[PDB]
């Protein structure tokens, strides 16, 4: 008829308040014969023999609730772990009260640990509530702590699953270093300015000093950290105007202990209304049997419903944390902490105090600086990308067309040849053609400059397993775009299902089908329906570009896998190699798009296309994810579609014949 | 597939009847294959306002008036795409290549 409560507490005043709350816990519960005894222990400068003394004293005491209430620990590890582990050896709930580490969030590791505080990742949820107020969609994550970094990124992806958006850049590395400045300069080149930081005080002061040396406290920069990053020398290195968080009654020890005693007491008086009430035996000497109502009492703690307390309502969720906590939002006004907001269970209310920013105005900084210099990557398309070496040094020969129009070239940068032939010989030459003048029209339309460069290979890009770690990766223009080295694939890119799963698309500019290049008895093929090409031989040589999207499109078509096993013996790197081989009568057929071969038939009259016109598809501009260059650019493309500018581009190259 | 059509009796009253009719064709097959793949529930009906869409003093009509004013969810049927229609709603990717032409003898 007795219940023991164990605690690790040092100060005699909080021990007296703890014993007074234990004595007053049986006040309003009538004249029932239950008794509540309390046992508190102090601290030894070590941690192993502390764990030993506490664990065997609470085994000999047979307590039901174990409390740790020491925020000023001299060790910066903040680990009450071994007492909770020894209680989890017999499945006894330990109620942690001070630390907020996410490693305690794992119920698989911490089988019988509960706490009345949330981890810091929920603060990012509050920062997700910052995404619901100021209409922000691109963040920059920086976490040094690898113990909580995976859980923080998992919670971040869970929160961004509702919007189905992704973070722009995430970083995890070893704490204690000082060169993170190159990563900060790479973050400077990004569009967003949202700085999310999750580390200790040393790494926070290091990145504050690194941002102060780079002078990242200008206009548009978003600064948003927590309570751990505004203490110690990080408070000395703190730039003004920074927006931080504050835990309401997180440091207030006495009311937290009183609320914990109320929660434990009402949980015990709820558990006394049930049967199958087992007791943990003397497990120190000759008793390794587990406490049989471990998960039962844990489920009793799962259904803990409350309506009274000092601060607010307390309830344990599927993770065992405190919900609906009130937070404070502080601002650093000239190295002075000024409160600028309050936070309810789910809602933010800024007060009448102004929001002073480190940059310019007091309104929200529109920190999405879009790319005004687009790194344009392209592949060498023969009717679209005409590449010519310069005359003397970086100049373009302004040749005139037959319509009185000078050719508007561009200084592109490209290699000589492929990697076995020419490994690294990249020069700036002059590029012009269809998509070059299309990009010139886009630059005339919108507010941007650009940077035209080429791709290192002659391939679009296919998904293939890299030989280490058994992972499928990309290459080509998709491999260079997703690496961040490029900005916009301006190329006749093959639109299919697999590419749209990873990036976003625009409206297609080119619309054409598929055909067969032959040379001119039926010398023609009449498309795919030739029965001699269904079961091929060494006579009719049909082939395609190596690592092309037509190969993937025919790889999905499992009913013509024999053509998949036939073109693999004759895969060519570029289409110009196929033109050179079919002019010298080494090839016999070539699956390729319609209008390119029609232009080559206008070049050379012996080139003949086939009769069947299948897979009438469209080619557009390769794009990034959700970006401010999506809606404006698609409206500009549609404006180019509605007028006769497509006919003008036909008059440049397509409609003209030779 | 069945659908309804609100056919009015006269011009004297605004009262009409929802006559149920059958439909087939291209977009019907597209919608049936979308219901096969996505496995959702659809609410198919017809518009009685008129043609595709035309703004008369910030008032759209037809399917544009049904979608922009949120009396429906999406327009599966045939619809031309220009600038202001792409401004008011979000089109999907194009699937069929349908331009304009001139019929002569």
XYZ file of C-alpha atoms in Angstrom:
763
model
C 0.000 0.000 0.000
C 3.062 2.225 -0.438
C 4.542 3.896 -3.520
C 8.181 5.001 -3.561
C 9.415 7.849 -5.771
C 13.133 8.187 -6.499
C 14.956 11.367 -7.451
C 18.480 12.649 -8.024
C 18.393 16.135 -6.511
C 21.030 18.232 -4.717
C 19.524 21.492 -3.417
C 17.754 21.176 -0.066
C 15.101 23.782 -0.924
C 13.897 21.900 -4.001
C 14.054 18.663 -1.987
C 11.818 20.290 0.638
C 9.437 21.465 -2.102
C 9.504 17.949 -3.602
C 8.629 16.350 -0.254
C 5.934 18.991 0.330
C 4.391 18.198 -3.062
C 4.531 14.466 -2.246
C 2.800 15.186 1.082
C 0.158 17.383 -0.605
C -0.396 14.849 -3.407
C -2.614 12.753 -1.102
C -4.613 15.804 0.021
C -7.535 15.879 -2.429
C -7.571 12.106 -3.076
C -9.686 11.318 -0.008
C -8.874 9.046 2.923
C -7.545 6.130 0.864
C -4.842 4.006 2.494
C -2.172 4.662 -0.168
C 1.133 6.127 1.023
C 3.715 8.085 -0.970
C 7.356 8.041 0.137
C 10.183 9.963 -1.546
C 13.914 9.209 -1.725
C 16.413 11.699 -3.154
C 20.155 11.271 -3.700
C 22.966 13.808 -4.276
C 25.897 13.747 -6.768
C 29.513 12.410 -6.859
C 31.966 14.126 -9.329
C 32.120 10.888 -11.367
C 29.401 9.206 -13.451
C 29.946 5.426 -13.243
C 29.792 5.129 -9.454
C 26.962 7.681 -9.461
C 25.082 5.320 -11.794
C 25.928 2.414 -9.474
C 24.821 4.191 -6.280
C 21.576 5.467 -7.823
C 20.684 2.180 -9.547
C 21.234 -0.108 -6.556
C 19.621 2.398 -4.165
C 16.503 2.587 -6.341
C 16.455 -1.203 -6.705
C 16.642 -1.486 -2.903
C 14.009 1.268 -2.610
C 11.711 -0.218 -5.324
C 10.602 3.145 -6.708
C 8.120 3.678 -9.548
C 9.206 7.089 -10.908
C 12.797 8.282 -11.340
C 13.533 11.997 -11.674
C 16.653 13.886 -12.782
C 16.488 17.647 -12.211
C 20.020 19.018 -12.725
C 20.373 21.654 -15.471
C 23.772 23.061 -14.341
C 25.819 19.918 -14.888
C 29.575 20.550 -15.294
C 29.824 17.962 -18.074
C 28.453 19.218 -21.393
C 27.255 15.740 -22.415
C 23.967 16.061 -20.431
C 23.548 12.285 -20.087
C 21.301 10.823 -17.369
C 21.293 7.730 -19.627
C 22.605 4.876 -17.356
C 19.922 5.153 -14.654
C 17.270 5.127 -17.391
C 19.018 2.120 -18.952
C 19.053 0.239 -15.639
C 15.357 1.022 -15.175
C 14.763 -0.154 -18.751
C 16.414 -3.420 -17.759
C 13.241 -3.901 -15.681
C 11.045 -1.523 -17.791
C 10.528 1.267 -15.246
C 9.582 4.765 -16.523
C 12.184 7.457 -15.866
C 10.825 10.990 -16.302
C 13.586 13.198 -17.643
C 13.133 16.866 -16.861
C 16.164 18.881 -18.045
C 17.721 17.847 -21.354
C 16.064 17.875 -24.778
C 18.276 15.481 -26.748
C 16.678 13.629 -29.656
C 18.573 10.422 -28.796
C 16.075 9.992 -25.942
C 13.290 10.179 -28.546
C 14.068 6.625 -29.716
C 11.696 4.323 -27.843
C 13.565 1.325 -29.278
C 16.733 2.334 -27.422
C 15.027 4.079 -24.486
C 12.363 1.465 -23.783
C 11.056 3.039 -20.553
C 12.026 6.713 -20.737
C 9.482 9.531 -20.787
C 9.934 13.284 -20.594
C 7.838 16.425 -20.247
C 9.948 18.463 -22.708
C 10.093 18.271 -26.528
C 13.328 17.988 -28.522
C 14.709 20.944 -30.443
C 13.429 19.651 -33.812
C 9.934 20.820 -32.825
C 11.503 24.297 -32.744
C 12.088 23.753 -36.464
C 8.368 22.929 -36.552
C 7.904 26.424 -35.116
C 10.246 27.504 -37.894
C 7.924 25.565 -40.189
C 5.286 27.847 -38.677
C 7.608 30.634 -39.820
C 7.092 29.200 -43.309
C 3.311 29.558 -42.877
C 3.442 33.283 -42.027
C 6.008 34.991 -44.254
C 5.431 32.696 -47.301
C 8.890 31.130 -47.571
C 9.589 27.981 -49.583
C 13.390 27.520 -49.659
C 15.548 26.925 -46.581
C 19.237 26.318 -45.864
C 19.935 23.651 -43.227
C 23.188 23.390 -41.262
C 23.529 20.715 -38.564
C 26.817 19.757 -36.921
C 25.420 17.364 -34.287
C 25.269 13.951 -35.959
C 23.447 12.429 -32.968
C 20.319 14.474 -33.731
C 21.010 15.476 -37.342
C 19.326 12.479 -38.966
C 16.267 12.898 -36.731
C 16.145 16.632 -37.496
C 16.375 15.998 -41.248
C 13.701 13.291 -40.931
C 11.367 15.667 -39.071
C 12.131 18.348 -41.674
C 11.231 16.004 -44.542
C 8.074 14.976 -42.656
C 7.075 18.644 -42.350
C 7.935 19.387 -45.993
C 5.950 16.337 -47.163
C 2.757 18.393 -46.724
C 3.956 21.014 -49.226
C 5.925 18.341 -51.190
C 8.920 20.690 -51.340
C 12.594 20.031 -50.648
C 15.382 21.918 -48.918
C 17.941 23.624 -51.129
C 21.065 22.484 -49.258
C 21.641 20.300 -46.193
C 24.975 19.826 -44.424
C 26.237 17.357 -41.816
C 29.869 17.237 -40.698
C 32.208 16.792 -37.731
C 31.911 19.341 -34.890
C 35.035 21.133 -33.708
C 36.334 22.348 -37.074
C 36.726 25.933 -38.290
C 36.738 25.835 -42.122
C 33.051 25.885 -42.966
C 33.622 29.152 -44.829
C 33.692 27.560 -48.292
C 30.311 25.997 -47.523
C 29.065 29.438 -46.473
C 30.301 30.895 -49.770
C 28.492 28.099 -51.616
C 25.410 29.026 -49.583
C 25.979 32.639 -50.679
C 25.635 31.533 -54.314
C 22.269 29.912 -53.526
C 18.986 31.739 -54.059
C 17.592 31.473 -50.527
C 18.962 33.179 -47.417
C 17.192 31.105 -44.733
C 19.838 30.027 -42.215
C 18.775 27.131 -39.978
C 21.451 26.091 -37.479
C 21.542 23.100 -35.117
C 24.830 22.716 -33.228
C 26.503 23.378 -29.877
C 27.884 26.715 -28.658
C 31.379 26.256 -30.124
C 30.223 25.562 -33.691
C 27.658 28.371 -33.412
C 30.345 30.858 -32.360
C 32.580 29.503 -35.142
C 29.951 30.059 -37.835
C 29.079 33.473 -36.341
C 32.734 34.508 -36.610
C 32.919 33.019 -40.116
C 29.837 34.969 -41.211
C 31.237 38.114 -39.576
C 34.507 37.748 -41.488
C 32.540 37.225 -44.719
C 30.119 40.043 -43.690
C 26.912 38.047 -44.191
C 24.851 40.477 -42.084
C 23.625 42.584 -45.008
C 20.153 43.011 -46.443
C 18.009 40.006 -47.302
C 19.841 37.548 -45.038
C 17.575 35.485 -42.782
C 18.952 34.777 -39.296
C 17.006 32.331 -37.131
C 18.608 30.273 -34.335
C 17.634 28.830 -30.965
C 18.486 29.181 -27.292
C 21.618 26.999 -27.435
C 23.196 29.240 -30.090
C 22.824 32.494 -28.112
C 24.844 31.490 -25.043
C 28.505 31.707 -24.093
C 30.893 33.166 -26.658
C 28.178 32.717 -29.299
C 26.275 35.447 -27.450
C 29.413 37.597 -27.686
C 29.723 36.763 -31.401
C 25.987 37.247 -31.996
C 25.058 39.744 -34.732
C 22.274 42.138 -33.826
C 18.771 41.822 -35.223
C 18.863 38.025 -34.955
C 15.601 36.204 -34.200
C 15.895 33.611 -31.438
C 13.637 31.382 -29.364
C 12.992 31.132 -25.630
C 11.488 28.275 -23.621
C 8.798 29.606 -21.287
C 9.436 28.091 -17.813
C 12.064 25.759 -19.246
C 14.608 26.954 -16.698
C 12.035 27.381 -13.895
C 12.858 24.332 -11.821
C 10.371 24.465 -8.933
C 7.147 24.673 -10.954
C 8.500 22.003 -13.317
C 9.129 19.673 -10.355
C 5.660 20.449 -8.947
C 3.988 19.718 -12.296
C 5.999 16.488 -12.568
C 4.844 15.434 -9.086
C 1.251 16.210 -10.082
C 1.561 14.161 -13.289
C 3.141 11.195 -11.465
C 0.606 11.360 -8.615
C -2.447 11.466 -10.883
C -0.945 8.667 -13.003
C -0.478 6.535 -9.866
C -4.028 7.266 -8.671
C -5.261 6.320 -12.152
C -3.230 3.089 -12.073
C -4.619 2.157 -8.640
C -8.069 1.709 -10.237
C -6.855 -1.444 -12.045
C -5.946 -5.054 -11.240
C -2.774 -7.045 -12.170
C -0.658 -4.686 -10.079
C 2.826 -6.203 -10.082
C 5.869 -4.943 -8.200
C 9.536 -4.850 -9.252
C 11.381 -7.246 -6.918
C 14.838 -6.991 -5.351
C 16.639 -7.174 -8.695
C 20.146 -6.589 -7.346
C 20.736 -10.069 -5.854
C 19.554 -13.120 -7.781
C 16.595 -11.568 -9.624
C 16.846 -11.025 -13.386
C 13.151 -11.576 -14.134
C 11.515 -8.612 -15.840
C 8.608 -6.612 -14.441
C 5.611 -8.117 -16.206
C 3.413 -4.986 -16.370
C 6.110 -2.852 -18.000
C 4.334 -2.098 -21.291
C 0.996 -2.100 -19.425
C 2.105 0.723 -17.116
C 3.739 2.359 -20.143
C 0.353 2.279 -21.913
C -1.179 3.795 -18.769
C 1.378 6.583 -19.206
C 0.425 6.813 -22.906
C -3.183 7.708 -21.999
C -2.182 10.447 -19.529
C -4.844 13.161 -19.858
C -4.613 16.310 -17.743
C -6.428 19.612 -17.305
C -4.587 21.247 -14.375
C -1.091 22.592 -13.883
C 1.031 25.691 -13.506
C 1.694 26.356 -17.195
C -0.633 24.356 -19.441
C -2.051 21.014 -20.495
C 0.308 18.016 -20.464
C -0.210 14.805 -22.464
C 2.061 12.106 -23.883
C 1.942 11.442 -27.627
C 3.285 8.575 -29.748
C 6.772 10.003 -29.046
C 6.172 10.789 -25.364
C 6.727 14.561 -25.473
C 5.008 17.719 -24.211
C 2.679 19.391 -26.694
C 1.000 22.812 -26.951
C 3.830 24.593 -25.148
C 3.997 28.383 -25.215
C 7.223 29.765 -26.700
C 8.806 33.214 -26.823
C 10.366 34.878 -29.864
C 13.223 37.230 -28.968
C 15.112 39.805 -31.023
C 18.637 41.102 -30.425
C 18.225 44.893 -30.507
C 21.790 46.284 -30.199
C 23.104 43.343 -28.119
C 19.951 43.418 -25.953
C 17.282 40.713 -25.902
C 13.900 42.207 -26.854
C 10.753 40.077 -27.012
C 8.957 40.359 -30.356
C 6.584 37.403 -30.335
C 4.677 34.710 -28.484
C 3.758 31.223 -29.686
C 0.697 29.180 -28.691
C 0.176 25.466 -29.368
C 0.177 26.152 -33.114
C -0.108 29.919 -33.695
C 2.363 32.824 -33.640
C 1.320 36.250 -32.361
C 3.864 39.066 -32.748
C 3.366 41.801 -30.169
C 3.336 45.580 -30.694
C 7.158 45.634 -30.700
C 8.735 46.191 -34.107
C 10.746 43.491 -35.877
C 14.205 45.004 -36.378
C 16.173 43.180 -39.088
C 19.979 43.163 -39.562
C 19.589 44.591 -43.080
C 17.187 47.315 -44.155
C 13.483 47.716 -43.442
C 11.389 46.236 -40.633
C 9.261 44.173 -43.044
C 10.133 40.675 -44.191
C 13.329 40.438 -46.288
C 12.550 38.867 -49.664
C 15.650 36.699 -49.489
C 15.035 34.733 -52.686
C 17.615 36.282 -55.010
C 16.925 34.547 -58.312
C 19.745 33.675 -60.710
C 20.371 36.784 -62.809
C 23.325 34.959 -64.439
C 22.066 31.613 -65.740
C 24.757 28.964 -66.217
C 23.471 27.606 -69.529
C 24.531 24.051 -70.367
C 23.876 22.463 -73.756
C 24.756 19.447 -75.877
C 26.160 19.665 -79.400
C 23.036 19.294 -81.530
C 23.880 19.492 -85.226
C 21.005 21.655 -86.614
C 20.617 23.574 -83.332
C 24.097 24.176 -81.860
C 26.593 25.364 -84.479
C 30.078 25.605 -82.956
C 32.885 27.483 -84.704
C 36.418 28.324 -83.521
C 37.278 31.976 -83.025
C 39.217 34.041 -85.546
C 42.040 35.460 -83.405
C 41.054 35.541 -79.709
C 37.489 35.152 -78.451
C 35.841 36.930 -81.389
C 32.946 35.824 -83.588
C 32.841 36.297 -87.361
C 29.597 38.225 -87.937
C 28.434 36.486 -91.092
C 25.235 37.669 -92.762
C 22.342 35.419 -93.741
C 20.373 35.539 -96.996
C 17.547 37.506 -95.337
C 19.719 40.465 -94.338
C 19.976 39.197 -90.757
C 23.371 39.029 -89.012
C 24.041 35.851 -87.064
C 23.840 36.586 -83.331
C 26.419 34.189 -81.886
C 27.549 33.753 -78.267
C 30.883 33.073 -76.558
C 30.394 29.461 -75.452
C 32.967 27.292 -73.674
C 33.411 23.725 -74.865
C 35.964 20.928 -75.104
C 37.570 19.652 -78.287
C 36.662 15.956 -78.325
C 35.733 13.004 -76.113
C 37.712 11.990 -73.005
C 39.813 9.161 -74.573
C 40.783 11.416 -77.479
C 40.971 14.853 -75.828
C 40.839 14.491 -72.005
C 41.012 18.164 -70.910
C 41.192 20.751 -73.735
C 38.354 23.251 -73.239
C 38.327 26.530 -75.171
C 35.858 29.381 -75.648
C 34.456 29.357 -79.186
C 31.380 30.817 -80.929
C 28.027 29.037 -80.675
C 24.855 29.925 -82.563
C 21.708 28.393 -84.004
C 18.143 27.718 -82.882
C 18.218 27.550 -79.076
C 20.919 30.244 -78.945
C 18.590 32.742 -80.621
C 15.766 31.403 -78.439
C 17.850 32.262 -75.366
C 18.590 35.680 -76.898
C 14.822 36.187 -77.239
C 14.368 35.111 -73.607
C 17.059 37.566 -72.469
C 15.314 40.277 -74.495
C 12.076 39.285 -72.744
C 13.136 38.993 -69.100
C 15.509 40.591 -66.582
C 18.587 38.363 -66.664
C 22.066 37.789 -67.997
C 23.407 34.296 -68.656
C 26.485 32.102 -69.125
C 26.532 29.614 -72.009
C 28.700 26.523 -71.599
C 28.638 22.973 -72.950
C 28.420 19.430 -71.591
C 31.479 17.200 -71.169
C 30.102 14.333 -73.285
C 27.856 13.636 -76.263
C 25.164 11.925 -74.206
C 21.820 13.039 -72.805
C 22.158 11.041 -69.587
C 20.993 7.612 -68.427
C 20.345 6.046 -65.033
C 22.939 3.326 -64.433
C 24.287 1.557 -61.352
C 27.631 2.958 -60.264
C 29.966 0.090 -59.429
C 30.373 0.971 -55.742
C 27.607 0.860 -53.065
C 25.001 -0.532 -55.585
C 23.282 2.781 -56.350
C 21.752 4.049 -59.581
C 23.117 7.440 -60.631
C 22.818 9.772 -63.609
C 25.313 11.417 -65.961
C 25.426 13.855 -68.872
C 23.281 16.970 -68.724
C 21.179 15.476 -65.920
C 24.366 14.639 -64.033
C 25.684 18.178 -64.452
C 22.381 19.939 -63.720
C 21.677 18.098 -60.462
C 25.285 18.622 -59.320
C 24.699 22.386 -59.114
C 27.321 23.215 -61.750
C 24.571 24.110 -64.248
C 21.393 26.172 -64.032
C 19.175 25.415 -67.048
C 19.460 22.705 -69.708
C 18.737 24.652 -72.906
C 18.663 21.663 -75.258
C 16.110 19.550 -77.168
C 15.704 17.277 -74.149
C 13.636 14.109 -74.473
C 10.572 14.420 -72.237
C 9.636 11.092 -70.638
C 8.290 9.735 -67.360
C 11.545 9.117 -65.459
C 12.999 12.625 -65.824
C 9.853 14.363 -64.552
C 9.975 12.295 -61.344
C 13.163 14.144 -60.328
C 12.998 17.624 -61.897
C 10.263 19.918 -63.206
C 9.445 20.675 -66.837
C 8.297 23.638 -68.912
C 6.122 23.858 -72.003
C 7.660 22.073 -75.013
C 8.894 24.143 -77.938
C 9.604 21.355 -80.444
C 6.951 18.885 -81.611
C 8.029 15.959 -83.782
C 7.974 12.190 -84.116
C 10.336 9.341 -84.996
C 11.677 8.164 -88.350
C 14.416 6.141 -90.049
C 17.373 7.529 -92.004
C 18.035 5.504 -95.166
C 20.010 6.077 -98.381
C 18.510 6.348 -101.864
C 13.599 -3.177 -104.923
C 12.199 -1.635 -101.741
C 15.081 0.421 -100.379
C 12.648 1.934 -97.864
C 11.719 0.325 -94.556
C 8.199 1.774 -93.887
C 8.885 2.217 -90.191
C 8.977 -0.368 -87.422
C 6.441 -2.653 -89.156
C 9.056 -4.186 -91.486
C 9.092 -7.945 -90.696
C 12.767 -8.202 -91.686
C 13.647 -5.795 -88.855
C 11.481 -7.580 -86.273
C 13.821 -10.586 -86.550
C 17.042 -8.858 -87.671
C 20.309 -10.207 -89.047
C 23.750 -8.945 -90.072
C 22.318 -7.335 -93.236
C 19.946 -4.562 -92.097
C 22.071 -2.444 -89.752
C 19.823 -0.286 -87.570
C 21.334 1.526 -84.599
C 20.945 4.486 -82.256
C 22.944 6.896 -80.109
C 24.815 5.354 -77.177
C 23.081 6.104 -73.840
C 20.126 7.838 -75.491
C 16.572 8.174 -74.211
C 15.328 6.168 -77.209
C 17.189 3.198 -75.699
C 15.290 3.634 -72.418
C 12.015 4.125 -74.327
C 12.615 0.821 -76.124
C 13.811 -0.809 -72.892
C 10.391 -0.130 -71.366
C 8.821 -1.704 -74.465
C 9.476 -5.355 -73.582
C 7.738 -6.668 -76.719
C 10.660 -5.544 -78.939
C 13.589 -6.622 -76.765
C 15.261 -8.234 -79.801
C 15.800 -4.715 -81.148
C 17.210 -3.918 -77.700
C 19.746 -6.737 -78.126
C 20.596 -5.652 -81.697
C 21.318 -1.925 -81.356
C 23.651 -2.635 -78.419
C 26.283 -3.944 -80.860
C 26.312 -0.689 -82.864
C 25.819 2.157 -80.367
C 27.493 5.338 -81.628
C 28.533 8.283 -79.478
C 27.139 11.116 -81.614
C 24.670 11.412 -84.472
C 27.391 12.936 -86.672
C 29.211 9.596 -86.430
C 26.001 7.955 -87.658
C 25.768 10.434 -90.552
C 29.422 9.777 -91.455
C 28.877 6.010 -91.290
C 25.673 6.097 -93.360
C 27.261 8.359 -95.993
C 30.093 5.824 -96.378
C 27.455 3.031 -96.695
C 28.405 1.301 -93.438
C 24.960 1.726 -91.851
C 21.512 0.919 -93.206
C 18.999 2.475 -90.772
C 18.962 4.908 -87.857
C 16.104 5.674 -85.460
C 15.991 9.445 -84.989
C 13.640 12.424 -84.717
C 11.824 13.782 -87.749
C 12.765 17.414 -88.404
C 16.508 16.977 -87.780
C 16.663 14.304 -90.477
C 14.434 16.482 -92.675
C 16.975 19.297 -92.295
C 19.774 16.854 -93.130
C 17.763 15.740 -96.170
C 17.640 19.413 -97.140
C 21.432 19.408 -96.710
C 22.064 16.147 -98.603
C 19.454 14.918 -101.080
C 20.408 11.237 -100.719
C 19.135 11.193 -97.115
C 15.575 9.806 -97.066
C 13.166 9.490 -94.130
C 10.729 6.607 -93.674
C 6.947 6.570 -93.985
C 5.727 5.792 -90.470
C 5.389 8.729 -88.057
C 5.083 7.281 -84.547
C 5.737 8.678 -81.047
C 4.653 12.232 -81.815
C 6.274 13.834 -78.778
C 7.656 17.206 -77.744
C 10.973 18.655 -76.633
C 11.233 21.424 -74.054
C 13.804 23.181 -71.866
C 15.423 21.233 -69.045
C 14.592 22.917 -65.757
C 15.254 22.783 -62.023
C 12.693 22.266 -59.229
C 10.179 24.857 -57.934
C 11.849 28.126 -58.907
C 10.922 31.749 -59.699
C 12.165 31.042 -63.253
C 9.212 28.713 -63.902
C 6.059 30.807 -64.357
C 7.610 33.848 -66.083
C 9.650 31.612 -68.399
C 6.674 29.406 -69.307
C 4.574 32.502 -70.040
C 7.411 33.805 -72.233
C 7.539 30.455 -74.067
C 3.764 30.580 -74.593
C 4.110 34.159 -75.868
C 6.686 32.805 -78.320
C 4.212 30.075 -79.310
C 1.244 32.370 -79.939
C 2.992 34.771 -82.328
C 4.918 34.202 -85.549
C 8.297 34.073 -83.834
C 8.256 30.287 -84.234
C 7.771 30.967 -87.942
C 10.720 33.382 -87.788
C 12.862 30.647 -86.223
C 11.665 28.374 -89.028
C 12.769 31.054 -91.516
C 16.214 30.993 -89.890
C 16.896 27.276 -90.201
C 13.863 24.993 -90.448
C 11.812 26.305 -93.383
C 14.894 27.113 -95.483
C 16.123 24.223 -97.629
C 19.312 23.593 -99.584
C -20.285 6.357 -68.860
C -23.411 8.193 -67.646
C -23.619 11.937 -67.138
C -26.268 14.607 -66.634
C -27.357 17.642 -68.629
C -29.499 20.435 -67.173
C -31.861 21.110 -70.087
C -34.331 23.935 -69.493
C -37.969 23.664 -70.548
C -38.390 27.154 -72.012
C -37.036 30.668 -71.698
C -40.048 31.593 -69.555
C -38.790 29.776 -66.437
C -35.283 28.925 -65.238
C -36.452 25.474 -64.148
C -35.055 22.505 -66.039
C -34.385 18.765 -65.843
C -31.127 16.839 -65.428
C -31.455 14.410 -68.326
C -29.029 11.501 -67.981
C -27.147 10.488 -71.132
C -24.274 8.194 -72.116
C -20.818 9.270 -73.276
C -17.855 7.660 -75.018
C -14.922 8.764 -77.164
C -11.348 9.866 -76.553
C -11.447 11.813 -73.271
C -13.879 9.263 -71.805
C -11.269 6.548 -72.406
C -8.587 8.841 -70.951
C -10.671 9.412 -67.810
C -11.430 5.692 -67.475
C -7.738 4.813 -67.713
C -6.966 7.526 -65.145
C -9.562 5.908 -62.882
C -7.875 2.554 -63.511
C -4.402 3.845 -62.639
C -5.027 6.327 -59.815
C -8.067 4.396 -58.416
C -10.111 7.383 -57.261
C -13.793 8.354 -57.386
C -15.003 10.825 -60.007
C -18.049 13.089 -60.373
C -18.712 13.507 -64.100
C -21.278 15.975 -65.440
C -21.774 18.510 -68.233
C -21.711 22.304 -68.293
C -24.793 24.240 -69.409
C -23.358 27.771 -69.514
C -21.821 27.374 -72.965
C -18.432 27.219 -74.680
C -14.852 26.929 -73.378
C -14.299 30.347 -71.822
C -14.511 34.107 -72.351
C -14.146 36.914 -69.818
C -16.912 39.537 -69.939
C -16.011 42.230 -67.349
C -14.138 39.897 -64.944
C -16.805 37.189 -65.417
C -15.787 33.927 -67.078
C -18.167 31.434 -68.661
C -18.321 27.712 -69.312
C -15.600 25.405 -68.019
C -13.421 28.372 -67.046
C -16.311 29.720 -64.978
C -16.753 26.294 -63.392
C -13.074 25.733 -62.535
C -11.856 29.257 -61.651
C -14.878 29.917 -59.420
C -14.235 26.454 -57.870
C -17.568 24.831 -58.690
C -15.531 21.877 -60.006
C -12.032 20.425 -59.517
C -10.432 19.905 -62.932
C -11.202 20.046 -66.649
C -10.414 16.718 -68.305
C -12.092 17.591 -71.620
C -10.687 19.471 -74.581
C -9.497 23.036 -73.986
C -7.172 25.388 -75.845
C -4.290 26.929 -73.897
C -3.257 30.587 -74.071
C -1.733 33.178 -71.744
C -4.615 34.245 -69.491
C -5.930 30.687 -69.087
C -2.466 29.689 -67.876
C -2.612 32.726 -65.586
C -5.924 31.836 -63.952
C -5.344 28.059 -63.507
C -2.474 25.570 -63.765
C -2.510 23.338 -66.831
C -0.819 19.949 -66.889
C 1.770 18.767 -69.416
C 0.468 18.524 -73.001
C -0.228 15.032 -74.299
C -1.691 15.499 -77.800
C -0.323 17.753 -80.556
C -3.390 19.709 -81.704
C -2.812 22.994 -83.509
C -4.954 25.050 -85.865
C -5.617 24.604 -89.573
C -7.669 25.908 -92.492
C -10.045 23.665 -94.433
C -10.334 24.240 -98.190
C -11.550 22.120 -101.102
